[PDB]
Nucleic acid binder design. Structure first.
Length: 655
DNA sequence: CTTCCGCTTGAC
DNA sequence: CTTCCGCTTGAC
DNA sequence: TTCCGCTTGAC
C-alpha cells in the first residue's frame, strides 16, 4: 500500500518524471487522448444505433450531449491504466494545464472511475522544485475549461460531418471539409490561381565586372527596368523604359575607364534569430546539419530524457526568467561585457500564459557544448550536434546586435549621347556578432579610375509567386492561428490522401477537385472557410472557459442560429443546419464541378470537370450537324493547373 | 458507406 | 553506361 | 522507382 499513480500526457514526460520520483509512485502516460466521438454511426453502442443523431455522435436535439468511446488505438493504454489502478492508493491526474490537457484529465476520470482519492495538478518542467510545488498545490477539475475544448471538439464534428455530405452530393463521394483542411487547402488554391492569372514580362540590363561586380542603374535621363517595376499582368507601374535584348546590346559599346560618382557609408544592425520551437528546429536541423525531421525529433527526445534540453513539442519561443538569466549570465562570462544587450531580450509570439517554453539547454546554469562533447561522442555524435545547435541559438539570442557597415558606391560612365549610370552594394562585418557561436579590396575614394573588364547582356524575367512548401504552409497557418503542432504534420498528409494536394518536389500543388471544393465552400460556405474563422472561434472559446458563456448556449446558437449570447458569425446568419440545408437544396451540382479557365479564339468557354475517373478538360463546339456536340480530353496530373494554358488545352483536344 | 480536430509516441 | 529537373529562402 | 546546391535577394 501507500503507492500513487501519476498519469501524464506524454510517454517522455512519464519516463523523466518516473526518474525523479522513485518507488511509491507509478508514472504512466495517456498517450494523449484516450476517448473521442465515434468516427462513424457503426461505432456507437447498440443503444443509440437507431437514433438519427448517431451519424454526428452528439445528440444536438438534447443539449448537444456528446457520445464518447475509448479510442481503438488507446485500448491498450486504457486497459493498462485500469490494471495499475488496482495496485495504488491515490491517483494524480497530472496532464497539461491547457484545455486539451484538462479534458484528457476529465476523460481519464470518466473512463477510470476511481474509488480512491484523486488530485489534479499541473507542472511546467521536470525539476524537484516544480514537482514539489505542483504536489503542494492540487485542485479539482475546471469544468469551464473542459467545456471549452468540448465545444471546440463538437464544433469540429458539426463542421466536418455536416458539410462533407454536401460535397458528396455536389462534387464527388468520400470528399471532406474541415475547419483546418478547407482553409489549408484554400491557402494553396489561392496561390495557384494567383500564378494562373500571372503574366510574365522580360527585361534586360548589364551586370559587368567593372573582386568587384557592378550593375546597371540608369541610362541617360531614365532609369533601367527592375524586377519591382512590373505588376502581375506584365504592365509597367506608371518614366523608366525596359531595356530589351536589342537595345541593351546596342549600348554594350571597347575598353573604357569608368568614373565614380558616390561612395557614401552608413552602418546597420543585424538581429539574432529567436530561440527554437518544434517547427523552427527541424528547419535548421535539416539545413545546417542535414538531419531528417523524424531523426531530429528522435534525437531531441533523448537529449530531453537525459536532462540536456527542454521539451521538444513547443509552439512557443519565449524563455523563462531562469533561462533568460542563465543565457545572459553565461554569455557575459563566456565572451565579454559589451557582448550583451542592455536588457534581456524576450521573444514572444501570438496566441497569448502559454505554458510552453522554447527548446533550450536544461538547468539554471547552462553547459557549454565543449563541456558535453567529452560526454557525447561515438554513436552519440549525432546527439551532440543537435545540442550545440540548440545551445548556440539560445546564447546568441541574448547577445548584443551584430553591427556592420554597408558601402553604396556609384560607378559612372558615358556612352555617346547618353550618360548611363551604374551602382553596386557591398557590406562587411565591423562588429563581432552572434555568429561567432553560430548563425581584392573594397576601398574606393569618390572619383577613381576603373576600367570595364567584362560585359554581358543580363537576361531577366519576372516570375510568378512561388508555391507553398510544407515549411512555408505551416508558417502561413501559424500567422493565421490555424492548426496545432500535433496536427500540422497530420493535416498535410490528410489533404493529400483525398487528392486535394499532391507534391511536386518540395512544392504543394493542388488538384482540380481542390479547386471545385474550394469554389463551393467560397461561394456558399463563405463564413466557414474565412481565414479569420478559427481566430474568432478562439475568442469565443475564451469566454466559455472564463465562465462568461455556457457550452450549450454557444452550440445552440452556432447550429440553430441565435442573437443572444456571445455574438457568432454563423449564428446570426441562421446557424449551420440552416446553411447546410439551403446548400443541399440550392447548389447546382452541374455548375460547381465545372472549373472555368478561359475562352479560346472562337470566344467559347473551356472547363475542367471533376468526373468519377478524375478531371477531364471539356469544351462545347459545333459538330458535323450544326449542334453543340462537345469535346473532351482526359486530364493527366502530369501538368499542374497553371501549366494548363490555351495551347496545351488545344494540344489535348488535338490528340 | 464516405466525413472532423486534437493528443503521444518509455519501458514494464 | 548510354537514362534526367519545381530553384527556395530571406540578405540588409 | 538510384542522386542535387549556390547565387539573387522577396521584405
Amino acid at each position: 500500500s501507500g503507492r500513487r499513480l501519476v498519469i501524464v500526457e506524454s510517454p517522455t514526460k512519464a519516463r523523466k518524471l518516473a526518474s525523479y520520483l522513485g518507488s511509491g509512485y507509478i508514472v504512466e502516460s495517456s498517450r494523449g487522448h484516450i476517448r473521442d466521438l465515434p468516427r462513424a454511426a457503426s461505432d456507437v453502442p447498440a443503444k443509440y444505433k437507431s437514433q438519427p443523431w448517431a451519424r454526428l455522435g452528439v445528440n444536438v436535439d438534447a443539449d448537444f450531449e456528446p457520445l464518447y468511446i475509448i479510442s481503438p488505438e488507446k485500448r491498450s493504454t486504457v486497459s493498462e491504466l485500469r490494471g495499475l489502478l488496482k495496485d495504488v492508493d491515490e491517483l494524480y491526474l497530472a496532464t497539461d494545464g491547457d484545455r486539451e490537457g484538462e479534458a484528457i484529465a476529465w476523460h481519464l476520470l470518466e473512463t477510470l472511475k476511481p474509488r480512491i482519492p484523486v488530485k489534479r495538478m499541473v507542472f511546467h518542467e521536470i525539476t524537484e522544485p516544480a514537482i514539489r510545488a505542483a504536489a503542494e498545490h492540487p485542485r479539482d477539475l475546471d469544468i469551464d475549461l473542459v467545456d471549452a475544448q468540448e465545444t471546440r471538439r463538437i464544433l469540429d464534428r458539426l463542421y466536418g460531418y455536416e458539410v462533407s455530405p454536401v460535397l458528396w452530393k455536389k462534387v464527388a463521394p468520400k470528399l471532406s471539409a474541415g475547419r483546418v483542411q478547407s482553409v489549408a487547402t484554400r491557402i494553396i488554391v489561392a496561390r495557384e490561381r494567383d500564378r494562373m492569372a500571372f503574366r510574365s514580362a522580360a527585361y534586360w540590363d548589364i551586370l559587368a565586372k567593372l573582386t568587384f561586380s557592378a550593375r546597371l542603374t540608369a541610362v541617360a535621363g531614365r532609369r533601367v527596368a527592375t524586377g519591382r517595376d512590373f505588376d502581375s499582368l506584365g504592365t509597367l507601374r506608371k518614366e523608366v523604359i525596359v531595356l530589351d535584348e536589342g537595345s541593351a546590346t546596342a549600348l554594350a559599346a571597347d575598353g573604357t575607364q569608368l568614373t565614380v560618382a558616390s561612395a557614401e557609408e552608413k552602418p546597420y544592425a543585424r538581429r539574432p534569430y529567436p530561440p527554437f520551437m518544434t517547427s523552427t528546429l527541424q528547419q535548421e536541423a535539416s539545413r545546417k546539419l542535414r538531419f531528417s525531421a523524424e531523426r531530429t525529433m528522435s534525437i531531441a527526445q533523448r537529449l530531453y530524457e537525459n536532462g540536456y534540453i527542454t521539451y521538444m513539442r513547443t509552439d512557443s519561443t519565449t524563455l523563462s526568467e531562469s533561462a533568460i538569466n542563465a543565457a545572459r549570465t553565461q554569455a557575459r562570462q563566456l565572451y565579454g561585457d559589451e557582448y550583451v544587450a542592455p536588457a534581456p531580450r524576450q521573444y514572444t509570439r501570438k496566441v497569448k500564459q502559454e505554458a510552453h517554453e522554447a527548446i533550450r539547454p536544461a538547468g539554471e546554469t547552462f553547459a557549454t557544448p565543449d563541456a558535453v562533447r567529452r560526454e557525447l561522442d561515438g554513436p552519440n555524435i549525432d546527439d551532440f550536434r543537435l545540442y550545440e545547435l540548440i545551445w548556440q541559438r539560445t546564447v546568441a539570442s541574448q547577445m548584443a546586435d551584430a553591427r556592420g557597415m554597408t558601402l553604396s558606391l556609384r560607378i559612372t560612365g558615358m556612352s555617346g549621347h547618353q550618360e548611363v549610370v551604374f551602382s553596386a552594394t557591398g557590406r562587411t562585418l565591423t562588429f563581432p556578432g552572434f555568429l561567432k557561436a553560430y548563425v581584392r579590396l573594397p576601398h574606393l575614394t569618390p572619383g577613381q579610375r576603373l576600367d570595364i573588364v567584362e560585359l554581358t547582356p543580363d537576361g531577366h524575367a519576372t516570375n510568378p509567386p512561388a508555391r507553398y512548401t510544407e515549411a512555408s504552409l505551416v508558417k502561413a497557418l501559424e500567422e493565421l492561428g490555424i492548426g496545432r503542432p500535433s496536427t500540422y504534420s497530420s493535416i498535410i498528409k490528410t489533404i493529400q490522401d483525398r487528392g486535394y494536394v499532391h507534391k511536386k518536389g518540395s512544392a504543394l500543388v493542388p488538384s482540380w477537385v481542390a479547386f471545385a471544393v474550394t469554389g463551393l465552400l467560397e461561394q456558399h460556405f463563405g463564413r466557414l472557410v474565412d481565414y479569420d474563422f478559427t481566430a474568432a472561434m478562439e475568442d469565443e472559446l475564451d469566454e466559455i472557459a472564463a465562465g462568461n458563456e455556457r457550452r450549450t448556449n454557444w452550440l445552440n446558437n452556432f447550429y440553430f442560429g441565435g442573437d443572444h449570447g456571445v455574438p457568432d458569425s454563423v449564428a446570426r446568419s441562421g446557424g449551420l443546419k440552416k446553411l447546410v440545408g439551403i446548400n443541399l437544396e440550392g447548389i447546382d451540382a452541374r455548375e460547381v464541378n465545372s472549373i472555368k479557365l478561359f475562352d479560346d479564339t472562337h470566344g467559347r468557354p473551356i472547363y475542367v470537370r471533376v468526373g468519377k475517373n478524375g478531371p477531364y478538360l471539356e469544351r462545347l463546339v459545333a459538330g458535323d450537324t450544326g449542334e453543340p456536340t462537345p469535346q473532351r480530353a482526359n486530364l493527366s496530373d502530369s501538368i499542374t493547373p497553371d501549366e494548363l494554358t490555351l495551347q496545351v488545352a488545344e494540344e489535348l483536344f488535338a490528340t
